[model samples]
Target: EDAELLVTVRGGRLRGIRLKTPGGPVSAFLGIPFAEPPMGPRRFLPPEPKQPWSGVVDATTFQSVCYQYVDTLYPGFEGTEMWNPNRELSEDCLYLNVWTPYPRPTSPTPVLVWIYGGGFYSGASSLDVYDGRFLVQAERTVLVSMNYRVGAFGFLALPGSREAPGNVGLLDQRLALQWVQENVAAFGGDPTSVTLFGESAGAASVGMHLLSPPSRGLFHRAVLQSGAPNGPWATVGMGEARRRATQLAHLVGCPPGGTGGNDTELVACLRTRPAQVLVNHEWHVLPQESVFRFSFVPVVDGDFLSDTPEALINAGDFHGLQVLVGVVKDEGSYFLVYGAPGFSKDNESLISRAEFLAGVRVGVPQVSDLAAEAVVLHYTDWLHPEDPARLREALSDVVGDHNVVCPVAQLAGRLAAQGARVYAYVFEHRASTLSWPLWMGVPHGYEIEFIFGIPLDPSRNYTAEEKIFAQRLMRYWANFARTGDPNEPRDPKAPQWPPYTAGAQQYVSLDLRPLEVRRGLRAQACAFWNRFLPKLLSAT
Candidate 1:
C-alpha cells in the first residue's frame, strides 16, 4: 500500500490516501481547501480563492463542516436523524474532496462533482454514505465532493444592503467549480468533460447554476435528481428573505431596526455574534397560512438571480446544456412524515380533508377556491373519504406532485421545448434495507443509495437482482458522464433511453430491472397543473 497520495494543485502540495476498490486502487484527495474560510469579517460574503499554502498540506482527513444545526434540531423523527451531519462543524468550511481510479489515468477521464442536499439547511461532504471509493471504482471516473456553507451562515439577505447578500453558498459552489476547471486536470481529469450531479437542494443548486450567467462554462453536463431551479423550496424573494433575516436577528438577541434602522449596524451586530448562537436558534419552516415555507434558502438578490427562474426560462435566458432531471416516485412521504405535524405519529393522528385543504392552500400560493376543489376531487379518495390512512396517502401524493414531481416535469418540458437535449426519469426502486415505513413507497432520498452504490444499511445484504440493478444504474450515470447520451452503447442489458421532446415527452421509468421508456407521465395531473398554475400565480 502506498503511504502517500500526493499531488500539487494551485494552492500547494496535498497528501491524501489510497483506498482499495473493485476496479483498482483509488487515490482519494480529501479535505482540500477551495476558498478562504467564510468566518468573522468574511461571513456572508462571496467566497474568495483560497490563499496558496507552503509545504505539503494534509488532505488525508476530512475538514470541519460548515456551521449547521441538523444534529441538534429535528427531534422525534428517526428519518431526520438519518440525514444528520455527523462531522465536526465550524465556520471555516470551504473544502472539497476528490477520488480518482489511479494516480494518473492513461487518458483524462470524465469528472463527476457531487453536491449533497439537506433542504439547503444541513449537509456535509464527510458523510460516510457519500464516500467516493465505490463510485470511482465502479464508474471508472473521477469523483469530487464539496463542503459549502448552509443555514443562516450561507444564505442570509438584507433588503438593499451589500453586507449580507444572499447566495454565498452558491458562490462557494461556483468557486469550487472554478477550482475544478483550473486544477482537476492535474489529477488526470478532463476539465472539459465534467458533469455536475446532485440530489434535492444540490440538484436545485445545479439548476440555479445553469440559469446564472456567472456559473456557465464550468461543467458540460448536469444530472438533477428530485429537484429543479424553479421548485417551490429553491428560492425566496428579497422581501421575505429580509423578514426572515430580521426575525433571525431578533431571535439571536441582535434585533434589527435599531440604531435608526441602520443596515450596517445590524450586519455588524450579526457578525459579532458567535456562529453557534445563530445556528442554535430555530427558524420557522412555514407560517400558519402560507403554502410554501422555507426559512433559509437562496433569494432573488438581483445578482445571483436577476429574475425568477420561470421568467428567465420564459425569456429564453438560459444555457441550453444537456441535462438529466428526475424525481423518485414518492418524493413527499419522507417530507410529510417528518415535516408535517402529527403525521409522524403512529395510527393516532390523521389529517382531515379540511386540514388537507388548508395545508394545500399553504403549499401552493394563490391557489383559487375552484382550483382547490379540483385538487381535492382529483387527489381525495371518493370511496373512503373519511379514512385517515387513505387521507394521509392522498396528502402525500398531493405534496409530492406539487412540491417536486410536477414542478420538475414543468422545468423539463420548458427545457425540452427550447431544443435542449434532456433525459428524464422517475426512480421507482425502493431499498430492501431502509428502516422507514414501507407505506411511503420509494420516498424522497431513497434513490441515493443506488446512485452512490452505497446501501441504506451497510450491515444488510442485498439480493442478486438488487446488485445488478445497482450496476446498471451506475453504468447509465457513468455513460452519461463520458458522453452526453446515457444510452451510449455500454451495456446491452440496459434499455434504450430516449431524449425528451415537447411533443413525445418520453421518460425512463427506473425500477429493479427491465427499465423501460414511458410516455406522458402524470398526463392528466400535469396538464391540470400546467393550466391551473399560471392562473394561480397571476391571481390578485
Candidate 2:
C-alpha cells in the first residue's frame, strides 16, 4: 500500500514514519528513548543525559516494558503473567513514547505527559489501562509517557552510596520532563503547554515535582488523581529508608552500603536473585510498618528535596499552575482487598483503637494521650462513622488520609493560598455492576474506566448507565486537558464558576450530577491533619 511519511527530530536524527489512524490520516511515533539506557553500571545511577544519533531511528515498534513486578491488584492481573512475551523486560528501560494528532509532521500540539501508577513499584507507559486514543482525538493534543526507576534500583538510598539521599525516581522523572521540554515540539507538541498528569503513585510523583528544584518550568499544569501532597511529613527522612535498604542487602547477601563489589558486581548479584525473593523480603524482613520500600520512593534528603514536598508547597515555594485533583469513593478497598494476606478490617480497628497503640508526643503544647485519642476518633468518625456496613464498605480513612486524602488537602490549601487555579473532586459512583461477589462500589482504581474511555473490566458485567458514565468521564477529562478546566457540562445559566482562592476556596466535586463546590474544605482538613504530622514524620 502507498504511504504518507514525515520527518521529525528525535535523538538528533531525521526520522520518517507512516501516519496511521482513521481520522482522515494521523502520524505517530512510538517508544522513543528520552534518556540513555539505565542498566549495568547505570542501574542505580540517575538517568543519563540523552546522546544524539547520526541517522533516523526506527519509529514503529515499541520498546521493552519497564522493570515491574507482576502484581495482582486489578482483576485478571495475577502474578503469573507479569512478564508479557510481546513486551520484553530489561534494566535498560529509560524510554518514552509519543502520539501526535497534528496534521503536518512539525505542527506543535499541546502536550499531555502521563505518569502511570503502581504504588511506585512497577508501571509502564504502554499499559492497556491508559490507552490514549480518545484523549488525542478529543483534545487535539500530543500525549507522552515514560518509564522511571522503581523499587531499590531507583530509590535505595545508602549512606555514602553514589545515589545520594533522596529521589532517584524523582530525578529520572525530572530528566524525562527535561526531555519533553527539549524534544516534544518536533513531534507536534508545544513544550510550553505541557501538562503533567498521573494516577496514584504517579500523582504523588507530580506532587514531588511541584516542589523539586530540577522540575521547575518543565511543565505548565498538573493533574493528580487519587494521591495527596505526599507524606504525613513524618517518615519523610532517610533514616528509616536506610534501615530498610540495609535489611534488603542483608537478605540478599549484599554489603551494607552495596559497596563491596564494583557497580556491575552489585547489580548482577541483585538481578539474579529471584524477583519473588525480593518481594518477600520487602514484605516480611524489612520494617514493613515504614512503607518506605514499596520499591524505593522519595525521601527528604537535603539535596534534591530539602524538605517534604508538602512543606515547600505549604510555604508557597512552588510555581503558580493550574491543577485538577480527586480521589475515588473507595480508594482504600484496593489496598484492603489486595495489598497483602494480612490486609483486612483490622485496619479500621487500628484507628478505633489508636488510643491503645503507642504514639509519640512531640514538643511542649504536647499531644497528650487525650489529644492522640481525639485525633484517631476524629478520622474514624469522618471516614468510618457509625455505619458498620460503611465500615465494611468503607476502608480506613485514617490510612487513606495517611497515604492519599489529607496530603491532597494540604497541597491545595498551600497552592490556593498562593493564588493558583485549582479544582478538587471526590468520585462517589461505585461499580456495583462490574463484578459479582467482589463488587465493593468504586473499588480502587475504578476511575481508570472513565479517565481513559475503557469499558469497565469486570469480574461480572457492566450496566448501560455505567458505560454512559464512562464516556462522560472521558469527555470531562479531555475537556479539562484542552482548556485547563473540566467544568464544561454545567448549565451555561449557572453563575460563572470561580477559580479556587484562599478565601472562597472553590472546587468542583466529580459525582453523578457534577457541578458542586465546597469552599475552603482545605483549611478545616489541614487543621485536623497538622496535629498528627509531627508523629508521622518521626515513624522510623
Candidate 3:
C-alpha cells in the first residue's frame, strides 16, 4: 500500500485502496473496525473500543452487516429496494468506512459521516447508493459511513440489569463518532469539523445525538434529512421497549421466569440464542395498530436520553450546533403507500374515500375520531374538487404533514427560536426513477441521491440535469461542513441558501426551480398539527 493510502490508528495499520475521481485518486478505507465484536458474552453491552491489531489489516472491502430482516415496500419498489441491507448478517458488525483525498490536502478536510436509515430495523453501510467515493471526490472532503447494530441485538430494552440497557445501536454510533473524533486526523480529516448527516432513521440518530448530553462534542454540525428523533415513530418509552424485549424472549424460546432475577436470566438466555432467530422474532413484536412504529427502537433511558426528543427540543436542552434540517415535498406518500403494505397496491388500484379515513386512523393511532374528522374536513379541498387523485393527494398531505414534514419544520422553528443557526428546506424535485406511482411526488428519502452525489456516478441511469443538480447539492452540504454557513466558498451560480429563523421562516426550495426561496411552507397545516390539533386532542 502507498504511504498515503496506508494509515495507522489504534487498530494498528490499515491497507486501503485508491479510488479514481475527477480530482485524481482518493484514499478509500472500507470495513475498518471501530468496536470490539459484540457477540456472546458482550451482547447488549455498550461497545468496547476496538483493540489494536497485530499486523496491517485489510480494509479494502466492507465487513458483515449487523443482523437485520431485509425488506422493501414492495417487490419492485426502487426507492426501498436501494436501501435494503446487503452483505452477510452477523452479530460481529460494528465496522466503519472512510474516504479522504489522497496525497493529503495541506489543510485538514472537513468530515461528513453518514448514518444509514432503515427505521431502526434493517440498515447496512454496504448499500451501493451510499458509497462515499463520488461524494468525497466531488466535494473534496473526508466522508465516512458506519454499520451499527439493528434489530433485537441493538435495541432490546429489558430493564432488570444495567449491563443490557437499551439504545445499544445508538451507543454503537456514539462509539464510531468518538473513533472519528480521535483518529480521523490520520486520513487528513478535521475531527473538530465533523458534520453528521442521514435520512429517516439515520437522520433521527443525528437528531438524538444533538439532544444527548453525552454526545455533545462528538459532532460539530448536523444535517437532518427527513428524520428526527422527535418524530412520532422514531422512539419508544421504556415500558414499550421492555414489553417488546420480553415479548421477543418468548418468541425465541428464552421467556423469562417469574423469579426475581429474570433480568439477568433474560439477558443470559437471549445472549446464547442465534442472532438470526432474534432478528426474525422482532418482526412479530410490532404494534398491531401501526406499521410505522417499529418494535425495537431507541428508548428514553434517562442516562442516554433524559427526556422525550420533543420535550428536549422544546426546552432547548440540546447542544447549540449548526443544523440543516428539511423534508421532501410529499414526505408522507412513501409511508402511505409502501409503509401501508396493501394501501395502494398500484396507482391503478385507486384508494377509496373510506380508505382515506382508514389511512388517517392507521397512520396516527392516537388520533381521536373528532380530530380525524377535522383532518378529513380540512384536506377535502373545495377548490380542487373530489376525486381519487386529489383525495389521495389530500390524504398524503395529512399523513406527510403529521408524520415527517411538520415535525421537521416544527423542529426547525424550535431551534431557530432558541438562537441556533438553522437552515430549512423543501426538496421539490422528483426523480423519474424510485418506481413510485405518478401521485407520489418527492416522497421521503427522495433527496438521498442528490445528497450523496449519486447522479455523479456513471453506474446508474441519471439525467444530465440531475448530474449538475447533484454536484451543486453536494457542494451545499460540503460547504456547510467546512463552515457553519452553506454559502461560503460558494460554487459559481449555486443559489444562495438563506438561514432559517422563527420570524421569517425562510427556507430554500431545492429544485431546478421556478421558485428558489419561499416563505411559509404549510403554515396552516403546521399550526393544526403542532398547535390546534394537540389542543383538540387534549380537550377530548
Candidate 4:
C-alpha cells in the first residue's frame, strides 16, 4: 500500500503519494499550481504567481493538460503515440509535478526540471513517458516536470499593445523555475543545483532560456536533445509574428488592421471567444511562400528574448553554463514520414533528383541551384546515380543535418568558443522492435526510450546487451545531474564521456555499447553548409 506524505511549499501545505522503490520510497507531489489559471483576463498574458491557499492542498492527481489538438489525424502512424498528451485538457493547466526520494534528507539534492516538447503547439508533462519515478530512484535526485502554455494561447503577439507581447509560454516556465527556487527545498531538492533539460522543441526552449536574461539564475546546467536555438524552426521575425497573429484573429472572426479601433476590438473579440474555438482552429502558419515556416512559436520580443538566437550567440551574449547537447541517428526520418504520407520502401522509388532539390529549396530558399547540387553531390552515392534507395538515404541525412544536426554543432561550437563546459553525444543505437520501415534508420526521439528507461513497446523482449546499455546510460545521466560531468563514473563498465572542444569538434557515439570519442563530427557536411554554402549564397 502507498503511504501519504505532506510537504509545505510556497502557497500552502501539500498532500502527496509515496511509492516504494528499490533505492528508497519516492514522494510524488503531482499537479501543484505554480501560477494562476490562464482563462478570462489571464489568457495570452504572462503568468502570475499562485495565490496563497488556506489549508492542506490535495496534489495527488494530475491537473488538466494544457489545451492542444489530439494527434490522431495521421492514420496508420503508431511510432509517435508516446509523445502525445492523452490527459484531460483545460486552460487551467499551469501545474508542475515533483518526484523526490522519500524520508526527506537533511541535505538537499540536485534538481532536474524537464520541459516537454511538441513543436510549441502540443505537449503536456502528465504523460506516462515523462514519469520521473525511475530517474529519481536511480539517481537519488529530485525530479520536476512542468506544463507551460503552447500554441496561440502560449505565444501570441499583436502590434501596438503589451496585452500579448508574445512568449507568455516562456514566461510560464520562468515562473515555474522561480517557484522551484522558492519551494523545491521543502521536497529535499537543492534550488541552486538545478538543471534544465528537454527533447526537440523542449530542447529549443532550454536553449532559449539560456539566451534569455530573465532565466539567468533559474538553472545551472542544460541538456538539449535534438534541438538548438539556432535551428531553422526555432523563431520568427516580429513582423511575421504580428502577421500570423492577425491571421489567427481573422480566422476566429476578429479582424485586425482595418482601423485604429480594429486592433483594440480584435483583442476584446478574441478574449470573448470560447476556448474550444481557439483550440480547434489550426493556429500554425504553414509553408505558403517559403519552406521555413513554424506556426505558434517564440519570437524576439525585446523582453524575454532581446534578439535572434543566432545574433545573440554570435555576439557572445548568453548565460554561461554546463551543457549536454546532441541528436539521434536518423533525426530527419520523422519529418519525412510525418510530412509525406505513405512514405515507405515501396514508394521510395518515386522521389527524383528534382524533387530532392525542391525539398532543399523549402529549407533554404536562398540556396542557389549550384549549392543545392553540391549538397546532393556530397551526400549522394557516386557509384549509383539512378539508385532510388541510395537517393532516399541521402535525402534523410540532408534533411536532418540541415534541420537538427548542423544547428546543434554550430551552437556547440559557439558555446565552446565562449568557454562554456559543453558535452556532446550522437545516439546511434538502432532499435530492432520498431514497426516502421527500417529504411528510416533510428528515427528522431528514439534515444528518449533509453534515456527515460521506458521502452516503446513493453511486451517486446530486450537483449541482455540492450539492458546493460540502458543501465549505463541512466547512470551516466544521473552522474551528470549530481555533478556537472557525465564521466564521473557511476558505472565501472561505462566509458568516460569527454568534453567537446570547438577546435577539435569531437563527440562520443552512443550505440548498443558506448563507443570511443570520435573527432571531426560531420566535418564534410558542416563545412559544405557553414563555409562553402554561405559564400556560394552570398556570391549568387
Per-residue accuracy of model 3 over 107-132 as CA lDDT, tens digit each: 88899999998889888989887878
Any idea what lDDT model 1 has? Answer: 0.80
Q: Provide TM-scores for the models.
A: 0.93, 0.80, 0.95, 0.92
In model 1, where do residues sit more than 4 Å from their true spots? 1-4, 71-78, 256-258, 289-292, 317-320, 339-342, 345-355, 361-371, 456-460, 490-493
lDDT of 1 by residue, 330-417 (tens): 8777666444544653443477766666656655555667767778888877898878778777777777787778778888888888
**lDDT, model 4:** 0.78
Q: How close to the true structure is residue 34 of candidate 1, measured as C-alpha lDDT?
A: 92
Q: After superposition, how far is residue 149 of candidate 3 from its true place, in Å?
A: 1.0
How many residue pairs in model 3 have overlapping backbones?
Answer: 0
Candidate 4, superposed: residue stretches over 4 Å from native: 1-4, 20-24, 256-262, 289-293, 317-320, 341-350, 362-374, 455-461, 489-494, 536-540
TM-score of 4: 0.92
lDDT of 2 by residue, 392-511 (tens): 432344445545666676677678668677877777776543441343446556676567644433332667676566666765666566677765655575433456665666666565
Task: Report model 3's TM-score to 2 decimal places.
Answer: 0.95
lDDT of candidate 4 over 279-390, digit per residue (tens): 7675344545343245778987677777789888888733457889888888876676444323453344346666555655554545668887777788877787756666
**Candidates in descending lDDT order:** 3, 1, 4, 2
| Best model number under lDDT | 3
Q: How accurate is candidate 2 locally (lDDT)?
A: 0.61
Clashes of 4: 1
- lDDT, model 4, position 232: 77
